[PDB]
Amino acid sequence: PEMVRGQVFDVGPRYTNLSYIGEGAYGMVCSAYDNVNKVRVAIKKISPFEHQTYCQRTLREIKILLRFRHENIIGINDIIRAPTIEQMKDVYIVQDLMETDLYKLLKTQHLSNDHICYFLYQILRGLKYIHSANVLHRDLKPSNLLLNTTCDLKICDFGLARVADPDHDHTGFLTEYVATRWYRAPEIMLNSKGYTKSIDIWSVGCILAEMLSNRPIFPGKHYLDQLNHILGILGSPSQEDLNCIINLKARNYLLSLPHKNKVPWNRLFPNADSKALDLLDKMLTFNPHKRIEVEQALAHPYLEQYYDPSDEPIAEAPFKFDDLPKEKLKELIFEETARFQPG
Numbered sequence: 001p002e003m004v005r006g007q008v009f010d011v012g013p014r015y016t017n018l019s020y021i022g023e024g025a026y027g028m029v030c031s032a033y034d035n036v037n038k039v040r041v042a043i044k045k046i047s048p049f050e051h052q053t054y055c056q057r058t059l060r061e062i063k064i065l066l067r068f069r070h071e072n073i074i075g076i077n078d079i080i081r082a083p084t085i086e087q088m089k090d091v092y093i094v095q096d097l098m099e100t101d102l103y104k105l106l107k108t109q110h111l112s113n114d115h116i117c118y119f120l121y122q123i124l125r126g127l128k129y130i131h132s133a134n135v136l137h138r139d140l141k142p143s144n145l146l147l148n149t150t151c152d153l154k155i156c157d158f159g160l161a162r163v164a165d166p167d168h169d170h171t172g173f174l175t176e177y178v179a180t181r182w183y184r185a186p187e188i189m190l191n192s193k194g195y196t197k198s199i200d201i202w203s204v205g206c207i208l209a210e211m212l213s214n215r216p217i218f219p220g221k222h223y224l225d226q227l228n229h230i231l232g233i234l235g236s237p238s239q240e241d242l243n244c245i246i247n248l249k250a251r252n253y254l255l256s257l258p259h260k261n262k263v264p265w266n267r268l269f270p271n272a273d274s275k276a277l278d279l280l281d282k283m284l285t286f287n288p289h290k291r292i293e294v295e296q297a298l299a300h301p302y303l304e305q306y307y308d309p310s311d312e313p314i315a316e317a318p319f320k321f322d323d324l325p326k327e328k329l330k331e332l333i334f335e336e337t338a339r340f341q342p343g
């Protein structure tokens, strides 16, 4: 078997000349040469069979990424595993090798308005498809946006993705959450489980603001600091916006805070396109019900050069799928990856 950093990475004879990339949630990431398609590819090693939550996250993502087919969503080219469930300890997912992620690009490169406009268009075009499938990504951030050498953008990592459930979105004040803190909508800290489409639009708003200044707009250092970052710019919520929050603990926490004024967008971003800031305002709307939807964001004048709804496909079939033990999930993972076996 092929070794990387003294660890097994046996991607068989199809994939050769491995180079270390980094560490994923369930294992190592390497680049390799695909001897069949004659190109270098990205491969991720996943060892999730000892825990139920890691099995659920792996199965969910494989299921979603195998059903989805969209230019702005990363596809799964191949899945490498042992021929039997007994011999299967690891899972290798193969994807097109992308040049960079928006995270690494934002650390050293100034984005022109043209690049910002084109990246946002592709994010929302990919998101329109995801949402039409009744799926929420729930972890949209710059490192989950991959780019090739010609700036083609692809949404990746559906490890925290759920089927949309707006009727069971309510929860109490200060409910724990799993998604990356800086891209969390204000309602997460107040009364929401992140089961509504409006949660992804907030994250896209945060990405748009990050693209305009190369810095995360709300870098909260801890759970409650994140809300205080959001309120420091949006300002105190209106009486109407507070009235919409029925949870007393959440409403009274907001009421206990001193008045904060709204920071004008053109003050935070003085070189930004005015149409870009008008769309940013609609994505970074405090009230989830008034926050713009993915299709209305695509129709916004800022994205006029690209908007073409007949060229913005929707999923053919929306999704439907944790209490299952790791043993039953391993078998479901085995079954879900069977199509990639030589026979």
Ligand SMILES: Cc1onc(-c2ccccc2)c1-c1ccnc(N[C@H]2CC[C@H](O)CC2)n1
Binding pocket: 021, 024, 029, 042, 043, 044, 093, 094, 095, 096, 097, 098, 099, 100, 101, 104, 146
């Ligand atoms: C980063 C990353 O983290 N995990 C993966 C991965 C996930 C599933 C399957 C294969 C790779 C990737 C991935 C997927 C596709 N292309 C790339 N390209 C990156 C971007 C350039 C470098 O930062 C490292 C390689 N990575």
